[PDB]
């Protein structure tokens, strides 16, 4: 006449060519004939109800009601996280195949396969600020777990895929937009370094955002030798 | 008895081959036994009293006194100014060779032939915070009169007779010492701008953080390394 879903229900079986029909909080059921399975109804509340449906009459008739007034606990064999693209979200409400996502997972684990920041990704930590940066993916799981959010407006100059020319940060190519004109460091190493008493006035140089300076200062005049879109390093004596 | 000396009194003579005794204000007399001459006694006041002594009795008798009671005025060909070295100096008392030197003469107004400042000599305004400057001298005169007293220390670098490099003010070579390490301008153009497909530069020696005009054409800044200022050029 009615029944109560066990704290951890799984398999039902409505009596007789009589069909379960479920009003639930979210699509979690997996029905087959008069039988039905509640797959990972974690947090689920509602009712199955075996209703016969005489076909000429066209009316219903509920003959047994499995009921579940109170959310379910966990289970085993129930994943509680899913990849929304390449990002993990803790299924608030599922479910291997019934995750209801809402929020990306913060990070606390170890063995970081790689991080990903402003589009480009980084294994190893040359030249960033810290290495825990952006979305980082652990060794096992195939998706990116949030760790922090640091600007990609690193000090008056911006790291983006839509950029004016390419620095190289870490040992990985990258692209960058000026967001300013005042003097400020560049957050990448130069990409390429084009060249030109013994031999008098010899220098190396590199294209650059107006007023920004790659390390290091001139070995010589001991400062950042900027002109327009370029920076120089002189050798002489 | 007593004789007040004429405004331009110049010669005196005691009578009885009798010595004169010059009780005076400053040394300006020439003596010749019973006679005496007052050489350029401008401002002098005093008395020669023609005293006389007897070998026989020991009687000493003043037989005539000449008094100047009030200072003599400037007189005739008595130059009441004298060079002390090279600096035209006033004559507080007296005239040529009796002159009692006083303060140096200011530049009242005249045709300045040459100035001398910080131990170097200049005839044109080129390169100086002004001109005339320091102490100059007219053509008719032969000594320097004050004009002005600028500091020979220019925004922290000083132009002086000794060390530690030589630069140039106008036509005239000058020599200069640092007085700090803080960045600042040189008060002078450089001595020698030694010079040096490719790139190139000229350079010259300098005080630590001091800079000559001009800024590098290119980087548009004064590029001092340490003792030298550089000037680049690139295609
Ligand atoms: C509710 O969950 C199930 C399982 O994914 C979905 O049912 C399947 O969906 C399509 C069309 O409905 C069929 O091709 C499958 O054979 C269905 N299987 C069963 C047992 O019904 C259902 O569509 C889901 N609906 C949602 C999320 O709106
Ligand atoms: C949810 O999915 C996992 C697999 O992704 C299921 O666990 C596996 O179950 C199989 C049998 O199908 C076992 O032999 C494996 O050892 C399990 N594999 C892993 C990786 O855990 C789990 O049973 C599923 N939940 C259900 C069916 O409710
Ligand atoms: C992925 O790997 C992580 C660790 O690299 C595992 O997660 C840890 O699991 C232990 C116990 O199993 C917990 O104490 C920790 O909270 C987890 N975080 C740690 C220790 O980093 C996990 O086994 C793997 N995830 C799976 C199965 O996909
Ligand atoms: C400018 O470029 C040259 C060659 O491109 C640099 O040469 C390197 O520098 C040091 C000493 O000069 C050598 O030990 C390295 O082996 C050289 N490496 C290469 C790849 O040539 C030179 O140092 C550069 N000068 C700078 C940056 O001031
Ligand atoms: C007045 O007459 C002369 C002018 O210089 C001075 O004569 C000197 O006097 C000293 C003693 O005071 C003698 O020892 C020197 O031999 C003299 N030298 C010369 C060059 O004449 C005299 O002192 C003067 N009186 C003063 C300045 O009060
Ligand atoms: C002081 O010296 C000046 C010279 O600078 C004398 O003035 C001249 O003296 C001559 C005779 O020696 C006179 O005929 C003129 O009056 C002057 N001529 C010139 C060209 O200056 C002056 O005699 C001196 N006075 C003294 C010692 O009392
Ligand atoms: C050189 O020239 C100056 C400037 O002219 C002379 O000054 C003159 O002398 C009188 C007083 O002796 C001043 O009151 C006047 O300003 C000047 N007179 C004239 C006509 O210009 C100065 O005496 C001269 N110095 C010399 C001859 O040594
Ligand atoms: C750097 O030195 C060169 C020669 O050593 C100077 O070249 C002269 O300067 C001007 C403009 O550059 C040319 O018109 C002349 O023809 C050049 N003359 C000679 C003899 O070369 C150059 O001016 C110097 N740049 C500086 C000091 O900034
Ligand atoms: O098992 U039948 O409609
Ligand atoms: O992680 U490392 O050069
Ligand atoms: O990329 U290159 O000379
Ligand atoms: Ca070298
Ligand atoms: Ca007379
Ligand atoms: Ca004075
Ligand atoms: Ca020198």
Swiss-Prot record, chain B:
Glycans are attached at residues 27, 96, 140, 202. The transmembrane domain is responsible for ER localization. The lineage of its organism: Viruses, Riboviria, Orthornavirae, Kitrinoviricota, Flasuviricetes. Homodimer; disulfide-linked. Heterodimer with E1; disulfide-linked. E1 and/or E2 are probably responsible of cell attachment with CD46 and subsequent fusion after internalization of the virion by endocytosis. Probably functions as a coeffector of fusion providing structural integrity to the fusion complex and possibly controlling exposure of the fusion motif in E1. It is found in: Host endoplasmic reticulum membrane; Virion membrane. Residues 1-235 are lumenal. It is a single-pass type I membrane protein. The chain holds residues 783 to 1023 of 3988 of the full protein. This is Envelope glycoprotein E2.
């Amino acid at each position: 006449d009615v029944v109560e879903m066990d704290d951890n229900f799984e398999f039902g079986l409505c009596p007789c060519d009589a069909k379960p029909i479920v009003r639930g909080k979210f699509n979690t059921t997996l029905l087959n004939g008069p039988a039905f399975q509640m797959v990972c109804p974690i947090g689920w509340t509602g009712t199955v109800s075996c209703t016969s449906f005489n076909m000429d009459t066209l009316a219903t008739t509920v003959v047994r009601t499995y009921r579940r007034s109170k959310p379910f606990p966990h289970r085993q064999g129930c994943i509680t996280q899913k990849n929304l693209g390449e990002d993990l979200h803790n299924c608030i409400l599922g479910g291997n195949w019934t995750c209801v996502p809402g929020d990306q997972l913060l990070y606390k684990g170890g063995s970081i396969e790689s991080c990903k920041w402003c589009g480009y990704q980084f294994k190893e930590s040359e030249g960033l600020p810290h290495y825990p940066i952006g979305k980082c993916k652990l060794e096992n799981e195939t998706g990116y777990r949030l760790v922090d959010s640091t600007s990609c407006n690193r000090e008056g100059v911006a790291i983006v895929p839509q950029g004016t020319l390419k620095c190289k940060i870490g040992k990985t190519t990258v692209q960058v937009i000026a967001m300013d004109t005042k003097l400020g460091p560049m957050p990448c190493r130069p990409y390429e370094i084009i060249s030109s008493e013994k031999t008098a006035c010899t220098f190396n140089y590199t294209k650059t955002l107006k007023n920004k300076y790659f390390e290091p200062r001139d070995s010589y005049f001991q400062q950042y030798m900027l002109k327009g879109e370029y920076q120089y390093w002189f050798d002489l004596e």
